[PDB]
C-alpha cells in the first residue's frame, strides 16, 4: 500500500 503519512497526514 501507500505510507500512512502520504495518505492521511499533511
Amino acid at each position, epitope marked *: *500500500h*501507500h505510507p*500512512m503519512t*502520504e*495518505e*492521511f*497526514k*499533511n
Partner: antibody
Amino acid sequence: QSEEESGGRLVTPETPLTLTCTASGIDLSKWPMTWVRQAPGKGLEWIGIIGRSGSTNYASWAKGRFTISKTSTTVDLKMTSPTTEDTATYFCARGGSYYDLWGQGTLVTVSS
Amino acid sequence: QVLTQTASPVSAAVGNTVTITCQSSQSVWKNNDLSWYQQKLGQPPKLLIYYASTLASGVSSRFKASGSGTQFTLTISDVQCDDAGTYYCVGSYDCSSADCNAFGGGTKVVVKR
C-alpha cells in the same frame, strides 16, 4: 478554495442518508479530507478521513455506520443505520493532520 | 483517544492573558501533530495553530502555543472582546494502531467586564 456541505435533512431512524461536500478550487487528489460533527450545544467529534489516494479510516465509535467516498469535485458521507444520537451539524474539512478549510455545515435530524 | 482540556470557563479581562491546556491520553504523531481551533456559535471552527506551535496564516500573533508528546498549551495574550468563544485541540495519531484523529472537549473563554 472553498467547501460547501449539503444533504442534511430529517430522516427516521435506520433510514440511510448521504451528505455531500462540494469542493471549489481544490484538487481533491492532493488533500486528505475529513468529516466532523457537532451535536447541538456539544463539542466537535471526528468521524473519519479519506486519504489522498482514496483509502479511508473511521472513528472507533462509528462501528462501520459511516462511509466516506470522493469524486474529483465532491466528498460524500453515507450514514447507514442512523439513530437519534446522530442528530448534529456535520462539517467537511480539508486536511488530515489539521484542518485549514471548513464548510458551513449541514444539519441532520434523526427523529420519528 | 481522549484529549482532556482545561475545564470551562477560562476568564480574562481585556488586555490580560489566558492559557488553555490539552492533555492527550497517548502521545501524538511524531510528538507534535497537534492543532488548535477557535469556534463561535453557528460558525465552523477556525484554525489557529498547527504542529503544536506554528501560527496559522492570518491569525493574530496574540496566539501562541507549545508542547510535545502528550502535553500542550495555547496562550492568548492581550485578550480582546472577540476572543470570547470555544477553543479545541485536535490530536493526530498513528492510523495503524489508533484512530487517526480526535478532538479535545473544548474550553470556553469568557471575557471579563
